[PDB]
Design a protein around this ligand. Structure first.
Ligand SMILES: On1c(-c2ccncc2)c(-c2ccc(F)cc2)c2ncccc21
Length: 344
């Protein structure tokens, strides 16, 4: 057990191991708060998160567990790594606070939105990380430029796993929180697959190429109209797959429109980018290209290496369908804190 010291920071007492020095507030929110620090043990600039209300309710305790399990599992260059997790508690009985540690990220994909080779390299890396997380049945569900961290050398990591679900109010109106979302999840059409994330990649790739939001809807309905103008109204085949009678019935109220010519939308773009976009931005999620198929697409020929695109270890998420009491989720979280072993 290391020695901890105490410090008042963004209104709470932070108690962290001495190895972590120069804590400075960088962020705050209902999730808790984040400080930058220097980890003297590794030489790394880290983000240290102190969870707020980790075990306040069943849903909170389970979410804290879910985040720790997810972050502990991620062992990939294009995905956030867990550097450390700790608590000042010496036993389960006195366990209350959880701190999570990862690499301090600076620039995101927003503070970057480029040449075609840049776009290649960035989208290549997203798909690389997606192949990895999808191979473990982990779906991101919320990919947007703001959780794609990029360094000076254009190296990319996907962030944001097991975070608190967005509220209805947060998804309302002219907001980037919804612009990258696949229509099936935006309108709750059906059970959604791993390729919800591929739809988001298409949106982000289009934005990298053009400098502009692809579907900047002023609300859910306006956004769907923007989507259907590009990719065409659904055929009978996908209509049957929308399990909500309400949604399907509404979709049917709309004037039929054909899929547009993507070369006429993405003017001047590499024809291979255009082809990839057409294969990612398919309305029927059963027909969308997957991460693994996309990595093999000619657009990425300069970066594609089938021997350097690893898959993940099996990820047991049986806990997701488990009902437990607050104290049970907390004990499982404890066990996970205690069993953590740092990366090399
Ligand atoms: O910005 N930010 C961050 C963050 C990450 C990296 N650099 C700056 C902030 C995290 C985070 C910090 C440490 C972890 F182990 C996991 C997530 C985070 N979590 C919730 C909400 C916002 C967050």
């Amino acid at each position: 057990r290391p020695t901890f010291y105490r410090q008042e920071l963004n209104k709470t007492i932070w108690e962290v191991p001495e190895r972590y020095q120069n804590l400075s507030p960088v962020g705050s929110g209902a999730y808790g708060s984040v400080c930058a620090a220097f980890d003297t043990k590794t030489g790394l600039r880290v983000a240290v998160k102190k969870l707020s209300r980790p075990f306040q309710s069943i849903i909170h305790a389970k979410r804290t567990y879910r985040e720790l399990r997810l972050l502990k599992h991620m062992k990939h260059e294009n995905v956030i790594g867990l550097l450390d997790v700790f608590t000042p508690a010496r036993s389960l009985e006195e366990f209350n606070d959880v701190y999570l540690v990862t690499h301090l990220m600076g620039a995101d994909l927003n503070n970057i939105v480029l040449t075609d080779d840049h776009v290649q390299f960035l989208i290549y890396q997203i798909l690389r990380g997606l192949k990895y997380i999808h191979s473990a049945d982990i779906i991101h569900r919320d990919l947007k430029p703001s959780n794609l961290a990029v360094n000076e050398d254009c190296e990319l990591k996907i962030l944001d796993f097991g975070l608190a679900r967005h509220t209805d109010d947060e998804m309302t109106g002219y907001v980037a929180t919804r612009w990258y979302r696949a229509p099936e999840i935006m309108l709750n059409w059906m059970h959604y697959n791993q390729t919800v994330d591929i739809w988001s990649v298409g949106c982000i790739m289009a934005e990298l190429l053009t400098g502009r939001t692809l579907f900047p809807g002023t609300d859910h309905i306006d956004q769907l109209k923007l989507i259907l103008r590009l990719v065409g109204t659904p055929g009978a085949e996908l209509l049957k797959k929308i399990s909500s009678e309400s949604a399907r019935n509404y979709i049917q109220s709309l004037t039929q429109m054909p899929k547009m010519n993507f070369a006429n939308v993405f003017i001047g773009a590499n024809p291979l980018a255009v082809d990839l976009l057409e294969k990612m931005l398919v309305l029927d999620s059963d027909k969308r290209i997957t991460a693994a198929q996309a990595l093999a697409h000619a657009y990425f020929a300069q970066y594609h290496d089938p021997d350097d695109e690893p898959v993940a270890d099996p990820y047991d998420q049986s806990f997701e369908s488990r009902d437990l009491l607050i104290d049970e989720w907390k004990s499982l979280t404890y066990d996970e804190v205690i069993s953590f072993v740092p990366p090399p």
